[PDB]
Design a protein around this motif. Structure first.
Motif, PDB file in Angstrom:
ATOM      1  N   UNK A 101       0.773  -1.250   0.000  1.00  0.00           N
ATOM      2  CA  UNK A 101       0.000   0.000   0.000  1.00  0.00           C
ATOM      3  C   UNK A 101       0.808   1.307   0.000  1.00  0.00           C
ATOM      4  N   UNK A 102       2.091   1.251   0.356  1.00  0.00           N
ATOM      5  CA  UNK A 102       2.919   2.450   0.532  1.00  0.00           C
ATOM      6  C   UNK A 102       3.918   2.616  -0.611  1.00  0.00           C
ATOM      7  N   UNK A 103       4.608   1.525  -0.949  1.00  0.00           N
ATOM      8  CA  UNK A 103       5.765   1.582  -1.862  1.00  0.00           C
ATOM      9  C   UNK A 103       6.964   0.907  -1.184  1.00  0.00           C
ATOM     10  N   UNK A 104       8.179   1.156  -1.704  1.00  0.00           N
ATOM     11  CA  UNK A 104       9.405   0.576  -1.115  1.00  0.00           C
ATOM     12  C   UNK A 104       9.584   0.956   0.362  1.00  0.00           C
ATOM     13  N   UNK A 105      10.036  -0.012   1.140  1.00  0.00           N
ATOM     14  CA  UNK A 105      10.142   0.109   2.606  1.00  0.00           C
ATOM     15  C   UNK A 105      11.577  -0.101   3.054  1.00  0.00           C
ATOM     16  N   UNK A 106      12.077   0.781   3.916  1.00  0.00           N
ATOM     17  CA  UNK A 106      13.408   0.597   4.488  1.00  0.00           C
ATOM     18  C   UNK A 106      13.310  -0.501   5.519  1.00  0.00           C
ATOM     19  N   UNK A 107      14.257  -1.435   5.486  1.00  0.00           N
ATOM     20  CA  UNK A 107      14.335  -2.516   6.479  1.00  0.00           C
ATOM     21  C   UNK A 107      15.772  -2.793   6.836  1.00  0.00           C
ATOM     22  N   UNK A 108      15.955  -3.457   7.980  1.00  0.00           N
ATOM     23  CA  UNK A 108      17.266  -3.965   8.377  1.00  0.00           C
ATOM     24  C   UNK A 108      17.224  -5.466   8.431  1.00  0.00           C
ATOM     25  N   UNK A 109      18.335  -6.064   8.015  1.00  0.00           N
ATOM     26  CA  UNK A 109      18.489  -7.513   8.017  1.00  0.00           C
ATOM     27  C   UNK A 109      19.811  -7.944   8.635  1.00  0.00           C
ATOM     28  N   UNK A 110      19.845  -9.201   9.068  1.00  0.00           N
ATOM     29  CA  UNK A 110      21.083  -9.869   9.446  1.00  0.00           C
ATOM     30  C   UNK A 110      21.774 -10.347   8.167  1.00  0.00           C
ATOM     31  N   UNK A 111      22.742  -9.551   7.712  1.00  0.00           N
ATOM     32  CA  UNK A 111      23.503  -9.835   6.497  1.00  0.00           C
ATOM     33  C   UNK A 111      24.889 -10.350   6.856  1.00  0.00           C
ATOM     34  N   UNK A 112      25.111 -10.653   8.135  1.00  0.00           N
ATOM     35  CA  UNK A 112      26.476 -10.913   8.624  1.00  0.00           C
ATOM     36  C   UNK A 112      26.861 -12.383   8.527  1.00  0.00           C
ATOM     37  N   UNK A 113      26.626 -12.974   7.368  1.00  0.00           N
ATOM     38  CA  UNK A 113      27.043 -14.340   7.074  1.00  0.00           C
ATOM     39  C   UNK A 113      27.637 -14.376   5.693  1.00  0.00           C
ATOM     40  N   UNK A 114      28.582 -15.290   5.507  1.00  0.00           N
ATOM     41  CA  UNK A 114      29.251 -15.426   4.222  1.00  0.00           C
ATOM     42  C   UNK A 114      28.269 -15.803   3.108  1.00  0.00           C
ATOM     43  N   UNK A 115      27.207 -16.529   3.451  1.00  0.00           N
ATOM     44  CA  UNK A 115      26.198 -16.900   2.469  1.00  0.00           C
ATOM     45  C   UNK A 115      25.567 -15.661   1.835  1.00  0.00           C
ATOM     46  N   UNK A 116      25.430 -14.585   2.627  1.00  0.00           N
ATOM     47  CA  UNK A 116      24.932 -13.317   2.097  1.00  0.00           C
ATOM     48  C   UNK A 116      25.981 -12.565   1.259  1.00  0.00           C
ATOM     49  N   UNK A 117      27.196 -12.462   1.793  1.00  0.00           N
ATOM     50  CA  UNK A 117      28.300 -11.847   1.080  1.00  0.00           C
ATOM     51  C   UNK A 117      28.482 -12.420  -0.333  1.00  0.00           C
ATOM     52  N   UNK A 166      21.128  -2.159   6.532  1.00  0.00           N
ATOM     53  CA  UNK A 166      19.932  -1.506   5.981  1.00  0.00           C
ATOM     54  C   UNK A 166      19.827  -1.700   4.484  1.00  0.00           C
ATOM     55  N   UNK A 167      18.640  -2.090   4.044  1.00  0.00           N
ATOM     56  CA  UNK A 167      18.339  -2.408   2.645  1.00  0.00           C
ATOM     57  C   UNK A 167      16.912  -1.933   2.348  1.00  0.00           C
ATOM     58  N   UNK A 168      16.393  -2.232   1.160  1.00  0.00           N
ATOM     59  CA  UNK A 168      15.090  -1.677   0.763  1.00  0.00           C
ATOM     60  C   UNK A 168      14.227  -2.791   0.177  1.00  0.00           C
ATOM     61  N   UNK A 169      13.057  -3.031   0.759  1.00  0.00           N
ATOM     62  CA  UNK A 169      12.095  -3.965   0.208  1.00  0.00           C
ATOM     63  C   UNK A 169      11.292  -3.263  -0.886  1.00  0.00           C
ATOM     64  N   UNK A 170      11.352  -3.811  -2.090  1.00  0.00           N
ATOM     65  CA  UNK A 170      10.681  -3.228  -3.245  1.00  0.00           C
ATOM     66  C   UNK A 170       9.498  -4.100  -3.703  1.00  0.00           C
ATOM     67  N   UNK A 171       9.232  -5.194  -3.000  1.00  0.00           N
ATOM     68  CA  UNK A 171       8.171  -6.084  -3.443  1.00  0.00           C
ATOM     69  C   UNK A 171       8.280  -7.438  -2.770  1.00  0.00           C
ATOM     70  N   UNK A 172       7.471  -8.368  -3.243  1.00  0.00           N
ATOM     71  CA  UNK A 172       7.446  -9.744  -2.719  1.00  0.00           C
ATOM     72  C   UNK A 172       6.723 -10.589  -3.747  1.00  0.00           C
ATOM     73  N   UNK A 173       6.899 -11.900  -3.646  1.00  0.00           N
ATOM     74  CA  UNK A 173       6.200 -12.821  -4.541  1.00  0.00           C
ATOM     75  C   UNK A 173       6.420 -14.258  -4.121  1.00  0.00           C
ATOM     76  N   UNK A 174       6.220 -15.178  -5.054  1.00  0.00           N
ATOM     77  CA  UNK A 174       6.373 -16.591  -4.740  1.00  0.00           C
ATOM     78  C   UNK A 174       6.874 -17.326  -5.966  1.00  0.00           C
ATOM     79  N   UNK A 175       7.538 -18.458  -5.748  1.00  0.00           N
ATOM     80  CA  UNK A 175       8.074 -19.271  -6.829  1.00  0.00           C
ATOM     81  C   UNK A 175       7.089 -20.403  -7.076  1.00  0.00           C
TER      82      UNK A 175
END
Ligand SMILES: *C(#N)C1([N]C(=O)[C]2[C]C3=[C][C]=C(O[C]/[C]=[C]/[C]OC4=C([C]=[C][C]=[C]4)C(=O)[N]2)C(Cl)=[C]3)[C][C]1
Length: 217
Positions: free
Chosen positions: A128-144, A164-173
């Motif tokens: 309903x708003x648009x892109x959202x600022x979020x924080x994530x645990x990115x502190x793993x080599x799998x993310x790097x 800090x990163x930005x959520x621009x959407x969501x979906x499913x596979x």
């Protein structure tokens, strides 16, 4: 909420940027969310100055290239009455003197909204708003070293976020298949053109719903 959302194709999202060797993730997340809300308001997408935030938002609680919070960035813009364009105040990946010039302001905000710490609330906000600022645990080599697919890291924390990163959407596979579409600030070579599909509805994976917010304009 819709089954899937992507704001990238609707004009809300600037090309992927690269923070380089500076701890300015929070500035990129904040400019992304403000870029989206300014577009929602004016119909014009204008890339905003991360450097302006790194250099000037110390008093609001930010630590320049050491790190910061998106809400402190939105507070700075409110207090300051504006934020310079990326073109007028280019990104240097180092902290220097405040050089804000109001003549070159292209964005403003009137505050910010913190979203309740639930993935369902984050989904409604993205829809309903648009892109959202979020924080994530990115502190793993799998993310790097992430390249593609739906990111899921068994050792991820839902409470201890560092990026800090930005959520621009969501979906499913259609072919554990739901995801958040997340814009990173590590350049276009990282992940999928600089984006990551983060596991969605798997118990707030990596704390994506734990520190979500957007500016009001
Ligand atoms: C980037 N690059 C970088 N990071 C941060 O700057 C980081 C982003 C972040 C983390 C956590 C949260 O939400 C939870 C709040 C945590 C308190 O963390 C604080 C940070 C910076 C200043 C004050 C508090 C912090 O870890 N920031 C958010 Cl919203 C954002 C530098 C590696």
């Amino acid at each position: 909420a819709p089954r899937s959302v992507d704001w990238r194709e609707k004009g809300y999202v600037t090309p992927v940027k690269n923070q380089g060797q500076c701890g300015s993730c929070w500035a990129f997340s904040a400019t992304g969310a403000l870029e989206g809300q300014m577009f929602r308001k004016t119909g014009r997408l204008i890339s905003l100055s991360e450097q302006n935030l790194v250099d000037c938002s110390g008093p609001q609680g930010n630590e320049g290239c050491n790190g910061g919070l998106m809400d402190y960035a939105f507070q700075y813009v409110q207090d300051n009455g504006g934020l310079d364009s990326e073109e007028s105040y280019p990104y240097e990946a180092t902290e220097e003197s405040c050089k804000y010039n109001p003549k070159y302001s292209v964005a403003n905000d009137t505050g910010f909204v913190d979203i309740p710490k639930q993935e369902k609330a984050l989904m409604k906000a993205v829809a309903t708003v648009g892109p959202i600022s979020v924080a994530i645990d990115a502190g793993h080599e799998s993310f790097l070293f992430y390249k593609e697919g739906i990111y899921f890291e068994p050792d991820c924390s839902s409470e201890d976020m560092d990026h800090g990163v930005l959520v621009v959407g969501y979906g499913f596979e259609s072919t554990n298949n739901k995801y958040w579409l997340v814009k990173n600030s590590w350049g276009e070579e990282w992940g999928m053109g600089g984006y990551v599909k983060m596991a969605k509805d798997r118990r707030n994976h990596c704390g994506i719903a734990s520190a979500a917010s957007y500016p009001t304009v």
